[PDB]
Amino acid sequence: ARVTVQDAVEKIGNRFDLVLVAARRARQMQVGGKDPLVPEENDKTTVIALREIEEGLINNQILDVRERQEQQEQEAAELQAVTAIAEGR
Amino acid sequence: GNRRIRSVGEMAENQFRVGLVRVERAVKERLSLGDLDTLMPQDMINAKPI
């Protein structure tokens, strides 16, 4: 278990944005889009996300960056599909 | 000395009293127009009211 979140609160000051950020990450794992960034002890995504904050590899900046990266990762696949919609003309 | 104690017996008497007054109005109302020997003390006094 994770008894006290104090260490995570150190990493992100607000402690409310912690709930938000840890949430956003916890759903990335629960809905299967991704996998944990740190050994899962049988901890549910709630606690796995908190360990990821404690280890400093996940926060609002990183996630926004990663997501902004993934946007271009899908835009690369569909590149031909959506440009084939030239029928708009 | 100014606090009096009632109990089932006293209270029931009051309710039975209330029943008799609401039946009283009826008995007078019927005995107003009553025909002489036809009606008797049954047709007047009801049950349900008391």
């Binding site: - | 049954q42 006094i45 009801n46 049950a47 349900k48």
Partner: protein, 51 residues
């Protein structure tokens, strides 16, 4: 209304009150209709009734 009238006399006349089938013979119709008629005739209870 006809039933109320009978129930009035029969209340003290019988000393208890006419049985559910008592007014039935007194009334013309099939006489089992007392139950049906008596039910739909009832007025709905206020849904705001404090309990």
């Amino acid at each position: 209304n006809k039933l109320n009238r009978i129930s009035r006399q029969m209340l003290q006349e019988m000393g208890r009150e006419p049985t559910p089938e008592e007014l039935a013979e007194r009334m013309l119709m099939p006489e089992d209709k007392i139950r049906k008629v008596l039910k739909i005739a009832k007025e709905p209870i206020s849904m705001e009734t404090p309990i």
